[PDB]
Design a protein around this ligand. Structure first.
Ligand SMILES: [Ca+2]
Ligand SMILES: [Zn+2]
Ligand SMILES: [Zn+2]
Lengths: 420, 58, 145, 48
């Protein structure tokens, strides 16, 4: 249990242990540019690449215990809500009573196997709903059709399929898998350090300040791929006309005495275009067989020009709203908290007029009359309060809570409004 | 009125969980049914309290 | 102090012209339109240098033969597989390039590594395009409004 | 503008009614009412 006592110590120390993990990876991938059969040299110290053989090991074990604290930090929390869900669910609808979830919705379908675990509601402290619904709904049915539905030597004495159920929940966290990815990224790049740099990806979840930037486009990216999905095909349109009518203007050739190259084969003329003409930028009238005297030149004259805008007006109108119209929403959304936080209440949601009709009141009205986290403190307290020694109120809203009803809340109808 | 114990305030004050409240806030000024806004808020209360139970044994 | 030594040597007495910054108050609208923002600004380029530092090493592993500053090889022909200059080549050239990186490579015609080179400029091209623009544009516009 | 116009549906759809076009204050002076007020008292496709 000293180990378990020590396990709490890394539960204590995660985020500092998280933060130093990158501080390995800089000097890791700082000296990975210090390479040159692949040679590495020394410049100042005595034993440098020996200390490389230290650090890659050293990073990897750092990449271990951070997830284990996380395995005891977030995993019991996120297992709880899913556990909180189904206990709230099966009382409220009884889908395994009635609905038996459909061909989609794998989540409860994964939990189609947890419902007959005998040590089921581990972290949700209301074990009786395993039998209360057998009294509530299983009244309407046979008890046994619900009781078979519901209910050293350590090698044989666990809720065996429950942990087996539990893993298919824990892999449905990205961040765990992202850390598990980071651990798999820890192994093989340590095994070969031409591939141990992409631990520097972890700046993405690194400075939270940065995540504003990627969210300013990762919210948008569903629309993004359509644009380039348009882009490749219009040049695929645009290639075939010259492939029909200008293919003689297509030399990668050095003066023809070379093995002079055209673009009228299977499929490369187009692949030429998107490789060159998109990476060109300066139009397509920079790489064609440059004309002086054709009459097809007239049709070539127009050809670059409408292509030029369809360089210009396409790619810009791709990226600009992607770089700007994406942005101002996040400028808006960070504004958007600052209205109800200022104007109205959260709880009674009324306005700043009424509670600063009284001088200085609305702050205090939000700090006495509504003071939201008081309710949190409150709901802890009644939970730890005896039911028998409830007050009238402590009985009352308990019963309100027990049916998940919430009509006690001072909705838009606060105190002093009806007074004088 | 009622009592507020002190130890729960000590579990309350962490900017970790204060920030979870903050992103929760920014989430719920955005999307969510109002008649269930306080519902999901309640569930948020439940899990955050349970979290402070976790933070207790540390 | 700028008054003294540039007076003592007038290859360095011009930066009194910096004082236009606190000069026309009309101008200070412009610098404030970015000096309010600059805390976010350096992160962007702080991202920028490392992704090419990612992007350099693959060609340093797999395309290093496509890296000639060389004049036809009979010269003292130069590669980019030394200590740390291939990357410094990239950020000096390919960022100051603009027209992609498929403008300065050993230009391909017939490799099968060319296929991996074909894709190489192209995703780099957007990561010229979609990176630097999305750096500067909100920096020039979302800063403004 | 298209960012605005897709915003622009989300005002009267939220604030007022369509039909009586009044506001969210009055029909959520009653708790939870304005939804139902738009789903009983006005519930547009009922008219259809
Ligand atoms: Ca009593
Ligand atoms: Zn209130
Ligand atoms: Zn109406």
């Amino acid at each position: 249990a000293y180990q378990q006592k020590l396990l709490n110590y890394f539960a204590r120390n995660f985020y500092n242990m998280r933060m130093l993990a990158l501080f390995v990876a800089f000097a890791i991938n700082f000296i990975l540019l210090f390479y040159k059969v692949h040679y590495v040299l020394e410049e100042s110290s005595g034993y440098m690449e020996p200390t490389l053989r230290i650090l890659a090991i050293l990073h990897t074990v750092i990449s271990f215990f951070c997830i284990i604290g996380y395995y005891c930090l977030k995993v019991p929390l996120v297992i709880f809500k899913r556990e909180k869900e189904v206990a709230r669910k099966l009382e409220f609808d009884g889908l395994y009573i009635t609905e038996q979830p459909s061909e989609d919705d794998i989540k409860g379908q994964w939990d189609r196997l947890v419902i007959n675990t005998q040590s089921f509601p581990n972290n949700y402290w209301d074990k009786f709903v395993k039998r209360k619904v057998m009294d509530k709904y299983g009244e309407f049915y046979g008890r046994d059709r619900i009781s078979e539905l519901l209910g050293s030597a350590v090698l044989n004495s666990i809720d065996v399929k429950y942990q087996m159920w539990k893993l298919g929940v824990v892999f449905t966290d990205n961040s765990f898998l992202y850390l598990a990815w980071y651990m798999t990224m820890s192994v093989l790049g340590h095994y070969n350090n031409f591939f141990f740099a992409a631990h520097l990806l972890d700046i993405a979840m690194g400075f939270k300040t940065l995540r504003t930037i990627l969210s300013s486009v990762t919210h948008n990216g569903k629309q993004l791929v359509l644009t380039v999905g348009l882009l490749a095909v219009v040049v695929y349109l645009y290639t075939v006309v010259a492939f029909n009518f200008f293919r003689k203007f297509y030399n990668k050739s050095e003066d023809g005495d070379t093995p002079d190259m055209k673009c009228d084969d299977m499929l490369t003329c187009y692949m030429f275009h998107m490789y060159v003409g998109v990476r060109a930028g300066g139009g397509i009238g920079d790489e064609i067989e440059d004309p002086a005297g054709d009459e097809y030149e007239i049709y070539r004259i127009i050809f670059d020009i409408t292509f030029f805008f369809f360089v210009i007006v396409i790619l810009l109108a791709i990226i600009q709203g992607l770089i700007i119209d994406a942005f101002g929403e996040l400028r808006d959304q960070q504004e958007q908290v600052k209205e109800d936080m200022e104007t109205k209440c959260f709880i009674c949601g009324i306005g700043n007029d009424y509670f600063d009709t009284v001088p200085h009141g609305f702050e205090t009205h939000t700090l006495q009359e509504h003071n939201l986290a008081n309710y949190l403190f409150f709901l802890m307290y009644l939970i730890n309060k005896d039911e028998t020694e409830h007050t009238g109120q402590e009985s009352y809203v308990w019963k309100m809570y027990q049916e998940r009803c919430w009509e006690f809340f001072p909705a838009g109808d606060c105190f002093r409004k009806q007074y004088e | 009125y009622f009592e507020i114990s002190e130890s729960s305030r000590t579990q309350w004050e962490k900017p970790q969980v204060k920030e979870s409240k903050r992103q929760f806030i920014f989430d719920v000024v955005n999307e969510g049914g109002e008649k269930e806004k306080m519902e999901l808020f309640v569930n948020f209360c439940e899990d955050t309290i349970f979290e402070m139970q976790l933070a207790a044994q540390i």
